[PDB]
Ligand binder design. Structure first.
Ligand SMILES: *[C@@H]1O[C@H](CO)[C@@H](O[C@@H]2O[C@H](CO)[C@@H](O)[C@H](O)[C@H]2NC(C)=O)[C@H](O)[C@H]1NC(C)=O
Ligand SMILES: *[C@@H]1O[C@H](CO)[C@@H](O)[C@H](O)[C@H]1NC(C)=O
Lengths: 49, 48
């Protein structure tokens, strides 16, 4: 109840902090992925347009 | 206009689908065999 600790010296430290900000933007083509460059498949994809 | 399906586009950049190329000519490659198959000696035999 009558004791206190007080520092007598210090130190300067440098700390690194890594944070992501953005990721890879991506685009997807519907006709190339679904229908393998075929005209018969693309005539049925229009109903799913 | 076909990709956005709206007949009307505002300001910006858009990615479009493929409507450019179309095939016009056909290529057929087959091995050159001329021996007619023995359909007469198999289907119409003397005794099945
Ligand atoms: C705090 O600690 C540092 C070392 O981390 C002490 O720095 C020294 O200070 C003396 C003079 O006081 C210099 O001659 C030395 O060159 C310093 N560096 C070293 C590595 O000895 C400093 O004195 C300390 N402070 C205190 C105990 O009050
Ligand atoms: C495109 O937008 C204009 C301006 O709003 C409008 O008048 C026009 O009818 C639209 N075009 C078609 C083909 O609908």
């Amino acid at each position: 109840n009558n004791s206190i600790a007080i520092p007598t010296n210090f130190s300067i430290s440098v700390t690194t902090e890594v944070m992501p900000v953005s990721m890879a933007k991506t685009s997807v083509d519907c006709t190339m992925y679904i229908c393998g460059d075929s005209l018969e498949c693309s005539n049925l994809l229009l109903q799913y347009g | 206009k076909c990709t956005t399906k709206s007949f009307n586009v505002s300001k910006g950049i858009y990615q479009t689908s493929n409507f450019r190329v179309s095939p016009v000519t056909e290529v057929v490659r087959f091995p050159n065999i001329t021996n007619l198959c023995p359909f007469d000696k198999v289907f119409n035999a003397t005794r099945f």
